[PDB]
Amino acid sequence: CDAFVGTWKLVSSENFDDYMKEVGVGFATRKVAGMAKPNMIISVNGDLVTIRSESTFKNTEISFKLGVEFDEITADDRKVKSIITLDGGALVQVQKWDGKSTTIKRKRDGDKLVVECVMKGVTSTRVYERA
Amino acid sequence: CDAFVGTWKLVSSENFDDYMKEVGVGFATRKVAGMAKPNMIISVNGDLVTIRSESTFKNTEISFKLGVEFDEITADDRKVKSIITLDGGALVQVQKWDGKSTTIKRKRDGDKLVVECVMKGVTSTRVYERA
Ligand SMILES: [Cl-]
Ligand SMILES: [Cl-]
């Protein structure tokens, strides 16, 4: 997780709005959430990994430890139980709620941070780049 | 809780710059902090409680459960071990780190929300009101 430390800006974004409706995000919200250009900020402090996302939509932040599951209240106001792991080079976050489950993958490609979000079939791709 | 849920704006501060130097914050960052008028958002989602602070300098979103110890990265970037309780009608937060310890009281007083911060002898006082 040392290769993720830094402030990142949103460059591209595709299949996002399609991903939202699958999770169960409201119409009016998907239009404002997807309309935003977040500023993902990852930083570590010992065993703690913080992922602060300052967007024009919401302002979320999650501090955690690898493997140890924690309570997370998503931006779209959804109480989920998340668990982030360093599976094969990437930061794989699995969010469980109401039996349902989604997966946020944060991989790396050269000078970019690629975020993948799966919600059964539909998978979004949002590319980031050092601010 | 529930008597804290809602949005609060800062309307006054006393001994904040005096209290921060005791915590150990740097002159530079101590000046920008006291110059900020943060908005403290407080919500509840089940047994989980979220207190968020939004201002011109540093944004924090601390989600927690009453009486259960949790890891927190303070705005001034300290790796503290916090624990919040409903003590005598007040949301009492205690931050332990490096042997030191600071207490943050969050009580209500009519239409106001009083925040008292104790660090040894000094005590910062900041009041908020519904947005
Ligand atoms: Cl790089
Ligand atoms: Cl009231």
Q: At A2, give phi and psi (nearest 5°).
A: -80, -20
Q: A73-111 burial string, b = 16+ CB within 10 Å, else e?
A: bbbbebebebbbeeeeebbbbbbebeeeebebbbbeeee
Task: Please list the residues that pair with A82 across neighbouring strands.
Answer: A70, A95
CA of A111 to the centre of ligand 1 (A): 5
Q: Is the dihedral of CA A120, A122, A123, A124 positive or negative?
A: negative
Quick one: tokens of A96? 């469980």
- Give Cβ neighbours of residue B18 (< 8 Å, ≥ 6 apart): B122, B124
Residues of each annotated binding site of B for a fatty acid? 126-128
Identify the residue among B73, B81, B97, B98 best suited for mutation to test binding to A, counting A beta carbons within 10 A and taking the highest: B73
Task: Count Cβ atoms within 10 A of the Cβ of residue A130 and give its class: 0-12 exposed, 13-18 middle, 19 or more buried.
Answer: exposed
Distance CA A74, CA B20 (A): 31
CB pair distance less than 8 Å for A61 and B61: yes
The 3-state secondary structure of chain A reads CCCCCEEEEEEEEECHHHHHHHHCCCHHHHHHHCCCCCEEEEEEECCEEEEEEECCCCEEEEEECCCCCEEEECCCCCEEEEEEEEECCEEEEEEEECCEEEEEEEEEECCEEEEEEEECCEEEEEEEEEC
Distance CA B90, CA B46 (A): 19
Distance CA A9, CA A128 (A): 5
CB pair distance less than 8 Å for B60 and A61: yes
Quote the minimal CA–CA distance from A120 to chain B in Å.
26
Q: Is the dihedral of CA B108, A60, B55, A36 positive or negative?
A: negative
Among B19, B8, B27, smallest CA distance to B125 is for: B19
Please state, in angstroms and as integers, the Cα–Cα distance from residue A78 to each residue in A17, B35, B51, B125, following that order. Answer: 17, 34, 16, 34
How is the beta sheet containing A6-14 ordered, strand by strand?
A: A59-64, A48-54, A39-45, A6-14, A122-130, A112-119, A100-109, A90-97, A79-87, A70-73
Quote the minimal CA–CA distance from A52 to chain B in Å.
9
Residue listed under structure tokens 């530079």: B28
The angle formed by the CA atoms of residues A86, B51 and A17, to the nearest 5 degrees, is 55
Chain-centre distance of CA A113, in angstroms? 11
Quick one: tokens of B70? 């949790």
User: Could you tell me which CATH class the domain B1-131 is placed in?
Assistant: mainly beta
Quote the minimal CA–CA distance from A55 to chain B in Å.
12
Distance CA A68, CA A80 (A): 14
Helix axes B27-34, B16-23, angle to 10 degrees: 150
Distance CA B20, CA B16 (A): 6
Quick one: tokens of B27? 């002159």
Q: Where are the domains of chain B?
A: 1-131
3-state secondary structure of B72: strand
